Design an enzyme around this catalytic site. Sequence first.
Site, PDB file in Angstrom:
ATOM      1  N   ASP A  12       0.796  -1.216   0.000  1.00  0.00           N
ATOM      2  CA  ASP A  12       0.000   0.000   0.000  1.00  0.00           C
ATOM      3  C   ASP A  12       0.842   1.286   0.000  1.00  0.00           C
ATOM      4  O   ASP A  12       1.744   1.443   0.848  1.00  0.00           O
ATOM      5  CB  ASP A  12      -0.865  -0.009   1.244  1.00  0.00           C
ATOM      6  CG  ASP A  12      -1.865   1.140   1.253  1.00  0.00           C
ATOM      7  OD1 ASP A  12      -2.789   1.103   0.381  1.00  0.00           O
ATOM      8  OD2 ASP A  12      -1.724   2.108   2.085  1.00  0.00           O
ATOM      9  N   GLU A  49       0.955  -1.099  -5.450  1.00  0.00           N
ATOM     10  CA  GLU A  49      -0.207  -0.266  -5.653  1.00  0.00           C
ATOM     11  C   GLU A  49       0.387   1.154  -5.786  1.00  0.00           C
ATOM     12  O   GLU A  49       0.741   1.777  -4.711  1.00  0.00           O
ATOM     13  CB  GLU A  49      -1.106  -0.370  -4.436  1.00  0.00           C
ATOM     14  CG  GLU A  49      -2.365   0.381  -4.651  1.00  0.00           C
ATOM     15  CD  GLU A  49      -2.469   1.679  -3.825  1.00  0.00           C
ATOM     16  OE1 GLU A  49      -1.531   1.962  -2.988  1.00  0.00           O
ATOM     17  OE2 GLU A  49      -3.533   2.395  -4.023  1.00  0.00           O
TER      18      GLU A  49
HETATM   19  O1  LIG Z   1      -5.173   7.201  -2.237  1.00  0.00           O
HETATM   20  C1  LIG Z   1      -4.048   6.838  -2.605  1.00  0.00           C
HETATM   21  C2  LIG Z   1      -3.253   7.724  -3.589  1.00  0.00           C
HETATM   22  O2  LIG Z   1      -4.010   8.285  -4.728  1.00  0.00           O
HETATM   23  C3  LIG Z   1      -3.518   5.524  -1.994  1.00  0.00           C
HETATM   24  O3  LIG Z   1      -4.457   4.380  -1.863  1.00  0.00           O
HETATM   25  C4  LIG Z   1      -4.189   3.472  -0.752  1.00  0.00           C
HETATM   26  O4  LIG Z   1      -3.979   4.003   0.611  1.00  0.00           O
HETATM   27  C5  LIG Z   1      -4.857   4.984   1.060  1.00  0.00           C
HETATM   28  C6  LIG Z   1      -4.257   5.164   2.529  1.00  0.00           C
HETATM   29  O5  LIG Z   1      -3.863   3.906   3.130  1.00  0.00           O
HETATM   30  C7  LIG Z   1      -6.257   4.373   1.112  1.00  0.00           C
HETATM   31  O6  LIG Z   1      -6.974   5.479   1.202  1.00  0.00           O
HETATM   32  C8  LIG Z   1      -6.680   3.649  -0.195  1.00  0.00           C
HETATM   33  O7  LIG Z   1      -7.971   2.981  -0.060  1.00  0.00           O
HETATM   34  C9  LIG Z   1      -5.539   2.664  -0.539  1.00  0.00           C
HETATM   35  O8  LIG Z   1      -5.915   1.972  -1.701  1.00  0.00           O
HETATM   36  C10 LIG Z   1      -2.576   4.697  -2.824  1.00  0.00           C
HETATM   37  O9  LIG Z   1      -1.477   4.365  -1.999  1.00  0.00           O
HETATM   38  C11 LIG Z   1      -2.255   5.436  -4.092  1.00  0.00           C
HETATM   39  O10 LIG Z   1      -3.497   5.380  -4.813  1.00  0.00           O
HETATM   40  C12 LIG Z   1      -1.102   4.789  -4.859  1.00  0.00           C
HETATM   41  O11 LIG Z   1      -0.225   5.790  -5.342  1.00  0.00           O
END
Ligand SMILES: O=C(CO)[C@@H](O[C@H]1O[C@H](CO)[C@@H](O)[C@H](O)[C@H]1O)[C@H](O)[C@H](O)CO
Length: 632
Positions: A290, A332
């Site tokens: 993540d 991700e």
């Molecule tokens: O919102 C996000 C950034 O646009 C983040 O997304 C990730 O973490 C967030 C916090 O834990 C959470 O809100 C989200 O559901 C998770 O998928 C991701 O790390 C990001 O998409 C990748 O670059």
Amino acid sequence: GPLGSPNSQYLKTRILDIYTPEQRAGIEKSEDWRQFSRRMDTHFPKLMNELDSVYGNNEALLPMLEMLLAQAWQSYSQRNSSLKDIDIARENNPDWILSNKQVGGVCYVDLFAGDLKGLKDKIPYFQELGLTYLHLMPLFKCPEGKSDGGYAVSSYRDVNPALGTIGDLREVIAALHEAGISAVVDFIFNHTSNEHEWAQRCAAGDPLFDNFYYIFPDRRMPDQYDRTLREIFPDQHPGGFSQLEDGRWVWTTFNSFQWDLNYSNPWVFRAMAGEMLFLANLGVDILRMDAVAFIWKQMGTSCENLPQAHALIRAFNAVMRIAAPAVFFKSEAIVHPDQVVQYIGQDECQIGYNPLQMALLWNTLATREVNLLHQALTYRHNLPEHTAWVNYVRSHDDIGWTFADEDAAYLGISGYDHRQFLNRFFVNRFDGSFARGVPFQYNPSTGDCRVSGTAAALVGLAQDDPHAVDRIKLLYSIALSTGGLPLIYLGDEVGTLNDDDWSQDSNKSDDSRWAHRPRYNEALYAQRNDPSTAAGQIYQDLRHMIAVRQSNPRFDGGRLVTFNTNNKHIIGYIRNNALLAFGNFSEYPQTVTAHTLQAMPFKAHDLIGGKTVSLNQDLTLQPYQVMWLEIA
Ligand SMILES: O=C(CO)[C@@H](O[C@H]1O[C@H](CO)[C@@H](O)[C@H](O)[C@H]1O)[C@H](O)[C@H](O)CO
Ligand SMILES: OC[C@H]1O[C@](O)(CO)[C@@H](O[C@H]2O[C@H](CO)[C@@H](O)[C@H](O)[C@H]2O)[C@@H]1O
């Protein structure tokens, strides 16, 4: 380094020092030790190189590494023999991720099945669908009330008690493995909740947790950093920092209650590597890494995608090669496409989400023009050996329009203007739009906005648009057939609509992503075998494509070649020189000419519709028709 410096052999002799001489002799002769020892030799030089590149001559580096490798041995020693068998198998088959046999699903345990026991009861459904991979959404303890849907973690070890216990999770994982399904979970390694013990202890000035986070006395450095930081949740707070009750400021890329961990402290790395080994020994097959982009910070830069972030992930990778070889990483990174792909590597993240393809599937539904999608499939699809995309249609998150402006500029498209259009279209603010999405994080300082809503909401199923079912099958066809591991957002396969309870639940109402996180819809699941219902049409048509992909080796691997259709509405590509896929993104019939098809065999079987298709005359596709033509 020179005679005297650390190396795998040095480190291994010191690991064994915890044993009595009698015990040591036995450990050295053991199978577990031989395996550990050979993986140390193979992969330790990478781990040391990556860590040296980040921490340099930091006094804590050698002590931290010896601590971590002692932990890696204890972890591998405890590791259950069935998991060691998976380790050997994946060590021998790095391309398991690339097999056409793999099809993934993702769900929240609570929304989809109530609790972990309830999820275990759903496993026969997962088998009926054909899944071989199941991502469960964050499972561990988190703040009551607002927890960013589990992503603000208060413990990496204690299960959220609404879901069950660590024992329940163990049984689920073993039940998944018995059923032929890999278990995939999040590794939320960039940040913890503000209620995590480490955060409380760090903020209280406990020396054991010094510099676990980035805490500042005032706005002097936050204001400096904020000159180059992108705002992820601008509705929540400006910039990258949030203020504590005592007046200090803490780095919070995401919500104010998620505090970014300080990887410039090597003890943070060791901490998180211990958590990684705990998840490994649960039998997790893939860790969703993540927020990979955010794990290194540097004044005057975006604090995204920095070289040290990539190095730390490769260090984490080498830890798994040493102590739990089965465990693979899924990146991700929802960022510029040039940067997305840099996380993908056998020694970094072996698989990664493909937000470019996903964003462009939606784009092409809106514009009816496959130009951007074709460009991406031509120039940005193929990956290094031993790695794969995770291709998807929707996720638990909003859709961000993450195509490359430089790419769009080659096509005469202004990225800024185009996103304004996509944003209007998908929230039903453009004449004629079939889409019923909801805005997410409109930012008035940048014009940026993203889109919330389920697949079925965004294609027109809420209003019974007669094309909605076919649009869903078309989008999934492409994720299922381009090459990579496809990931179904569970609920999409019966046409699940938005939750319109979300806007009025005060723990959710400031986060429109809850619109596309509905509960399991019993009524739609009950219609899945009825071909006269939208649920049944969606489910049987997805299930049919899954059956074909999984049984037909012409889908194997990650590589494709595009085919120029000479029709701006029709996408075309070839897998393994043997399977020619066409997808019509127009709501009207569209033709591929006999002239365009001259090199193809006269006839080919269409695996979608089951009919023989003539390719020596004009080929007319129905609105949103997909064909998967066997040409060899
Ligand atoms: O919102 C996000 C950034 O646009 C983040 O997304 C990730 O973490 C967030 C916090 O834990 C959470 O809100 C989200 O559901 C998770 O998928 C991701 O790390 C990001 O998409 C990748 O670059
Ligand atoms: O150039 C005229 C016309 O003839 C073909 O080259 C077929 O001989 C058509 O090109 C199509 O087929 C090619 C081989 O399968 C393929 O690589 C092209 O992508 C595709 O457009 C062309 O239209």
